[model samples]
Target: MNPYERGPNPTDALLEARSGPFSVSEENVSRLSASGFGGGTIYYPRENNTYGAVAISPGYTGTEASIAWLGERIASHGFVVITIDTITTLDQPDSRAEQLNAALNHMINRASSTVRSRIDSSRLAVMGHAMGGGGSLRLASQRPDLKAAIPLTPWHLNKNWSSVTVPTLIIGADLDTIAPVATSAKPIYNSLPSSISKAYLELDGATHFAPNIPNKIIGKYSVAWLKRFVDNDTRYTQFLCPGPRDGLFGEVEEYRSTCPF
Candidate 1:
């Protein structure tokens, strides 16, 4: 059974908090020519202790800046985060997955001395928005070695994701017409096997850009989720389990999870 399946309820204030103790800094990696991947920014906690790392990608036609908020926010919560750009904005999910993998490998092996010294490359996660979200799922399915996966408002033509085993958090926007919950997020959530831990969070009245912005609720959950899975920190279980009840907050429309791993 999952050790984190049961825990005390997280206080409302903690659920809507941000900016952990670690200071944050960012660096731009111009390009990865050998990997055929474009450059992107890397966000890390200024602390010396090793921490988990995550690779984030933007949606179709979205640049690295589109998801910069997530990288910084996640990094602030004590992780090494990378927000990468595809060779082209129109690249398909498979291509985006390739780029994400290559970028992740670089961070794991060839990152700058500052990053390599502090990041625990062995503990990794993948995150993305829209088309990049779909690519995140695809990468998780293909790479079982990943510790977790977070897909925000994912969009894809294919839905064969039964192979995904990484712990996953699927965040969807209720007002996203581009990737409706009924067709995109819900389907992706249902397609995964019950053997792995997973959760689905729907932001009420939120647009597809909800994950790109700095919402209190999103910040809280994202930090908690990554801390729980990527860091294997049970402290976050207080925030995830006994899932959100009805009428708690106007921002979170619905929340569901299969927690006991």
Candidate 2:
């Protein structure tokens, strides 16, 4: 396969070098900052044709490295992944939304460039962990540009969630105390407009950050969700749509309707 379309790693020089053309770099940080958005890291594969682009935001108290794992993993599967470092804390929701808006704009513009012309802007997706997930919900509800969204373990947001009208996936833990199912996930899930594609997965026995990370049984399932939705793959049909499962940690579920857009 092409090197530019490969996964991300800290030691890879060529992928890092390509940052000048289709990826974000420390130098681009200045331009990104000038756009009124804090500098965030972006990982783009070298493949000439981009299927889609993902804007990934980190969870509360989460670092860029933690979220990069998700971005890099998805990039390896052939789509360009853009990860943003939202505000250091979660008190400023409005400001974070603005920053996300800026980052999304920058990525959209990058997709138009000759080096990244392959990116399908119409298929753009946004995702985030914890508070970042809440931010994703806020943006997806407000912006019509996003085609898909995943709010992983979202927590603490205003109760007005019926405004969301885009396809969305909610990944959470059944027993997570920080973002409990009944209190946080279920409530938000309930509030989604029935016209949008939505699904909520409660990873059995999963802690807040346990389902999709190293050496976990649900890791593959987590990846499967993204591949099905963000990457638009068909092999994981069972996971992508409503279905029965024979496993403990996995069960497929779908919302009442699809986004008309």
Candidate 3:
């Protein structure tokens, strides 16, 4: 009786389309300053019901605008998405993690009325790119309350990820020199505990900046993963399980997972 098993198969077109019933809007709240976090933009669906939320942090020397497309896309899919700017672009992963958590708290307690009530603070997730992606994972390791974590081409010097309990989806770019798949993404995926569900996807011929912009493959699975774990929506299980075949869209170089759904 799981809903994930009952919905129509999620196709590339459906996942790519703005088919969700809720309309979307965005706000550039300057100085959104939380108690311990810097400010950033918030994107949310104009709906009455409470929905899961995801917080995003950009890579080193990057701004919220670098990952704004992701926020907009996730919001359009019926979730509240916030892309945060760190106090300093050069902040480390741990520092970014701190800011990410603070941003989530701000969204839950201090966000605009149009978004505050709509966020189901209980169902939360974190995502980021490069160092910010590593920071997202760091936050997941620290916060057991987070339902899901997605790190795109994450960069971190630490290799110990056994502490991460939240379900994770790590995206890597094959051609990335900044954080090679072998050194960062693959090792992080390998280090996660077997008890938690996890997935690793490597994009062929992609660069470090690939995930910063809108990507169909990344967008499809990111939404599915969040829906499945954060929202506890069974309708996304099918898309996640039986991981993507070799060369999906002629872009997926590899896809591996411990699909627990």
- Model 1 residue 32 CA deviation (Å) reads 5.1
Q: Global lDDT for candidate 3?
A: 0.84
1-261, model 1: which lDDT tens digit per residue? Answer: 433222234455754656654688887887753264577988987877788889998988899988888788788778889899888899988888887898788777777889888777778999999999898999998999999899889987876587999988898899999899899999998888877888899988799888877787777778788888987877787678855554754447888888754
Candidate 2 lDDT over 1-105, as tens digits, reads: 322222332222322231222333221333335364555666665656655777777766665666766666555555666667654545344555566666766
Tell me the spans in candidate 1 whose CA falls farther than 4 Å from its real position.
1-15, 32-34, 248-251
Which predicted model would earn the best lDDT? 3
lDDT minimum window of 10 residues, candidate 1: 1-10
List TM-score per model, in order: 0.91, 0.74, 0.93
| Shift of residue 251 alpha carbon in model 3, Å | 4.5
Backbone clash tally (model 3): 2
- Per-candidate Cα lDDT values, in order, are 0.82, 0.60, 0.84
Cα deviation of 18, candidate 2, in Å: 23
Please report the candidate that would top TM-score against the real structure: 3
Better of 2 and 3 by TM-score: 3
**Deviation of model 2 at 114, angstroms:** 6.9
